[PDB]
Design an enzyme around this catalytic site. Structure first.
Site, PDB file in Angstrom:
ATOM      1  CG  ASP A 209       7.534 -28.437  -3.883  1.00  0.00           C
ATOM      2  OD1 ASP A 209       8.347 -27.494  -3.854  1.00  0.00           O
ATOM      3  OD2 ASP A 209       6.811 -28.676  -4.868  1.00  0.00           O
TER       4      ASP A 209
ATOM      5  CB  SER B  70       3.811 -34.551   0.078  1.00  0.00           C
ATOM      6  OG  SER B  70       4.003 -34.460  -1.319  1.00  0.00           O
ATOM      7  NE  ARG B  71       5.314 -26.973   1.259  1.00  0.00           N
ATOM      8  CZ  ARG B  71       5.412 -26.955   2.582  1.00  0.00           C
ATOM      9  NH1 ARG B  71       4.988 -27.979   3.310  1.00  0.00           N
ATOM     10  NH2 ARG B  71       5.950 -25.903   3.180  1.00  0.00           N
ATOM     11  CB  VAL B  72       1.693 -32.522  -4.752  1.00  0.00           C
ATOM     12  CG1 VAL B  72       2.867 -31.666  -5.204  1.00  0.00           C
ATOM     13  CG2 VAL B  72       2.165 -33.884  -4.286  1.00  0.00           C
ATOM     14  N   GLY B  73       0.206 -33.608  -2.175  1.00  0.00           N
ATOM     15  CA  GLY B  73      -0.756 -34.419  -1.459  1.00  0.00           C
ATOM     16  C   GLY B  73      -1.752 -35.113  -2.361  1.00  0.00           C
TER      17      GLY B  73
END
Ligand SMILES: Nc1ncnc2c1ncn2[C@@H]1O[C@H](COP(=O)(O)OP(=O)(O)OP(=O)(O)O)[C@@H](O)[C@H]1O
Ligand SMILES: [Mg+2]
Lengths: 53, 498, 62
Positions: free
Chosen positions: B342, B367-370
């Protein structure tokens, strides 16, 4: 647990008891003799400097 | 006296049962690969055993012979030996009994300390959870590094990648993450406790011993498993250690608990797999790695899921560690794992030597979740910090007007704010306090060489005088208006008083 | 269970060792040499303090 994990349980018991009986010292305020200085300040701040001011 | 008594206790219970078992004769043994003849019913990737108690895996099922890889040393296997099939796919012990134990790739205790009391076994090669069980990543995984918790946050169930060169501070980030979880594991609620697993692949035993003693000093083995497949362990063990550790973490995530696993490195599992595949005679690929070298990792990092509340709610975070060559991120395994994971955390030697430690290259780290998986206070403050550093990085290559001069000043202040030491992770509220002080123009007056002094002294002052405010920020999980006003007055007072 | 002749054989050898363990039997000089070596190493790694009782302190005030 510890005295249960040692052969000469008597020796560790002796150390435990000596630890229990024996304590540690503590310093004093002799190095705090600067107590005196506080009073001197009262003279300038509250007696001398205050008055002439 | 009792030493021999407990010795006997072991014999008293033995394995009397001798069964009629299928077998095979070792046609040829060499380089760690045996070619057994027989074993007509042996399964694929099943576990077989040799006449000397040494295990192995039947990896190749050819019509005329079975290609077996030996999980250990190879000098003890002769031709015409006997291989008995155990009739069980390779599996490892799992459970809370493993916590605090150093084990090898196959789940055998390695530090003495007796055996593992595990009551359950799990197959290493298990399929990843489907599409339905998972649920988007919600909670934050608190790493303790300011630059990671603020600029490249990691959630629970995410699969970050720590990628860099040799000796830039990757294992240091892993150890800081492991150590930080002590505060949560010591507390009461079980929704924050995170059990850590450290897979050490290809690292010399001295390094793993240093790491284990470091964890013990920080009292972090209460909840850490260490699966060590060191350099002197046959390639079939370094190839399988990641999967063993991932099964030990799959147990936790499947039983409603949370786990964190750290493969270190995966670039050495790739090498061990290549050696295995080349000694089984399978044709090589690009850079001599087998064709199935992406699969090798994709099937392994896809097991780090975040189960929904119907499947327990447990999670398993993964932090694979890759090692590039002179920063050539464009290499083969680095690109595979970058397209698997990710996020990423790019450590750079040019930043390591320029004084920025951890060397995290916030420009490239992602960081995709961010937004998600970040506490509200950190979300509030790190956003403005991110914008300020983003603007600073543009005009940085040089060193006039008041606006841009102050922009550079703020950028530099924040940069020296993000530095940190080793094995001293910070509580999230403390990070919020420091970053808030830095980003609200307070440090712009100070010199940039003194920012470390500030950071440290401010932390020491707040941790004692204003424990109540930090508790408020932690419990409420946001910088409320009253909390903001307090923070304001504390920082204003402290700055002048220093 | 009374049938594994080697099971009872090992138990018998163990019992005989138990009886004969007044002093480590078949110790050979290697026993003493090792014992000394690793005791010496442990002594270094721990310290050279008074290896009977509690050493005293006599601290110093500021
Ligand atoms: N935040 C930090 N502050 C100061 N020094 C650091 C920091 N992080 C890492 N170092 C230094 O970097 C060195 C290498 O650290 P580390 O082992 O984490 O990197 P690594 O890439 O895992 O090394 P290798 O890949 O060779 O195992 C250590 O000796 C440590 O002193
Ligand atoms: Mg390392």
């Amino acid at each position: 647990y510890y005295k249960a994990n040692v052969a000469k349980a008597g020796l560790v018991d002796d150390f435990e008891k000596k630890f229990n009986a024996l304590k540690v010292p503590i310093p004093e305020d002799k190095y705090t003799a600067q107590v005196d200085a506080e009073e001197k300040e009262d003279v300038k701040s509250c007696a001398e400097f205050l008055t002439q001011s | 006296a009792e030493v021999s008594s407990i010795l006997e206790e072991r014999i008293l219970g033995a394995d009397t049962s001798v069964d009629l078992e299928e077998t095979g004769r070792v046609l040829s043994i060499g380089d760690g690969i045996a070619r057994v003849h027989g074993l007509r019913n042996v399964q694929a990737e099943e576990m077989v055993e040799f006449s000397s108690g040494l295990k192995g895996m039947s990896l190749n099922l050819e019509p005329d012979n079975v290609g077996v890889v030996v999980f250990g040393n190879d000098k003890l296997i002769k031709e015409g030996d006997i291989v008995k099939r155990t009739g069980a796919i390779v599996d490892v012990p799992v459970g809370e009994e493993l916590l605090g134990r150093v084990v090898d790739a196959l789940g055998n205790a390695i530090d003495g300390k007796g055996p593992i009391g595990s009551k359950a076994r799990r197959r290493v090669g298990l399929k990843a959870p489907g599409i339905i069980p998972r649920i988007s990543v919600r909670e934050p995984m608190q790493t303790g590094i300011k630059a990671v918790d603020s600029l490249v946050p990691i959630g629970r169930g995410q699969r970050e990648l720590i990628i860099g060169d040799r000796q830039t501070g990757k294992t240091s980030i892993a150890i800081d993450t492991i150590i930080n979880q002590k505060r949560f594991n010591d507390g009461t609620d079980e929704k924050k406790k995170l059990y850590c697993i450290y897979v050490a692949i290809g690292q010399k035993r001295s390094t793993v011993a240093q790491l284990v003693k470091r964890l013990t000093d920080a009292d972090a083995m209460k909840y850490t498993i260490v699966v060590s497949a060191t350099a002197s362990d046959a390639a079939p063990l370094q190839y399988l250690a990641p999967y063993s550790g991932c099964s030990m973490g799959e147990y936790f995530r499947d039983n409603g608990k949370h786990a964190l696993i750290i493969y270190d490195d995966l670039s050495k599992q790739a090498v061990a797999y290549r050696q295995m595949s080349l000694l089984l005679r399978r044709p090589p690929g690009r850079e001599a790695y087998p064709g199935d070298v992406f699969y090798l990792h994709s099937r392994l990092l896809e097991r780090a899921a975040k189960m929904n509340d119907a499947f327990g709610g447990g999670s398993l975070t993964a932090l694979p560690v890759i090692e590039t060559q002179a920063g050539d991120v464009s290499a083969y395994i680095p690109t595979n794992v970058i397209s698997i994971t990710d996020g990423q955390i790019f450590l750079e030697t040019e930043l390591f030597y320029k004084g920025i430690r951890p060397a995290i290259n916030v420009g490239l780290s992602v960081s995709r979740v961010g937004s998600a998986a970040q506490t509200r206070a950190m979300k509030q403050v790190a956003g403005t910090m991110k914008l300020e550093l983003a603007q600073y990085r543009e005009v940085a290559a040089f060193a006039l007007d008041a606006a841009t001069q102050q922009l550079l000043s703020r950028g530099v202040r924040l940069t020296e704010l993000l530095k940190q030491g080793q094995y001293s992770p910070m509580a999230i509220e403390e990070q919020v306090a420091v970053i808030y002080a830095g980003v609200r123009g307070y440090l712009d007056k100070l010199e940039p060489s003194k920012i470390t002094k500030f950071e440290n002294a401010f932390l020491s002052h707040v941790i004692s005088q204003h424990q109540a405010l930090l508790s408020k920020i932690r419990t409420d999980g946001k910088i409320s208006e009253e909390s903001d006003a307090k923070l304001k007055e504390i920082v204003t007072n402290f700055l002048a008083g220093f | 269970d009374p049938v594994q002749k080697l099971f009872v054989d090992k138990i018998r050898e163990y019992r005989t060792k138990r009886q004969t363990s007044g002093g480590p039997v078949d110790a050979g000089p290697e026993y003493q040499q090792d014992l000394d070596r690793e005791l010496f190493k442990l002594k270094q790694m721990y310290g050279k303090a008074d290896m009977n009782t509690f050493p005293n302190f006599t601290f110093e005030d500021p």
